[PDB]
Design a protein around this ligand. Structure first.
Ligand SMILES: COCC1(c2nc(C3CCCC3)c(C)c(-c3ccc(F)cc3)c2-c2nnn[nH]2)CCCC1
Length: 130
C-alpha cells in the first residue's frame, strides 16, 4: 500500500537513548548507531513481511494484522508482538519480561517515518525509497 517498497534510512533522532532503554550495551550501540539499514516491506494476501538489511544484522518478520506472534528482535530480545493498522499507521507493540515498547510506522510525504517509544524515550527514524 503506501508501505510497500525498499526504504533506506536517511535520518535518526535519539536512537542511542532508545537502545539504552532496551538495555543494549555500549559496544553494540556504537555499531547500531552508525549502520544504515534498508527496510523492504512486502504484502501477499493476509501476510505482511518486513525485512531489514544492515551490515550489522538482518531481521525479517512476517505477520497478519491483529495476530500476536513471536519475534526475535535485532538485539536478540524474545518478544510477543502484535501489529495493527490504525488510521493509516502501522502500530506494533512488543512485550517481554513485563516490559513493552511501541513502534509506529507511518507514511509521510515521500518518507517512511518510524517512531519507537520505550518508557520516556522516543526515537524517530526516517527512511526514503531507495
Ligand atoms: C536489522 O537491524 C537493523 C539495525 C537495528 N538494530 C537494532 C538493535 C541491534 C543493535 C542495537 C540495537 C534495533 C533495535 C533496530 C530497530 C530500530 C527501530 C525499530 F523500530 C525497530 C528496530 C534496528 C533497525 N531496524 N530497522 N531500522 N533500524 C539498524 C542499525 C543496526 C541494526
Amino acid at each position: 500500500d503506501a508501505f510497500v517498497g525498499t526504504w533506506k534510512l536517511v535520518s535518526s533522532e535519539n536512537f542511542d537513548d532508545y537502545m539504552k532503554e532496551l538495555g543494549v550495551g555500549f559496544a553494540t550501540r556504537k555499531m547500531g548507531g552508525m549502520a544504515k539499514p534498508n527496510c523492504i516491506i512486502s504484502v501477499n494476501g493476509d501476510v505482511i513481511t518486513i525485512k531489514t538489511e544492515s551490515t550489522l544484522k538482518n531481521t525479517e518478520i512476517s505477520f497478519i494484522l491483529g495476530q500476536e506472534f513471536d519475534e526475535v528482535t535485532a538485539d536478540d530480545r524474545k518478544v510477543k508482538s502484535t501489529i495493527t493498522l490504525d488510521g493509516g499507521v502501522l502500530v506494533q507493540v512488543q512485550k517481554w519480561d513485563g516490559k513493552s515498547t511501541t513502534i509506529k510506522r507511518k507514511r509521510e510525504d515521500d518518507k517512511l517515518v518510524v517512531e519507537c517509544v520505550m518508557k520516556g524515550v522516543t526515537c524517530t527514524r526516517v527512511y526514503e525509497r531507495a
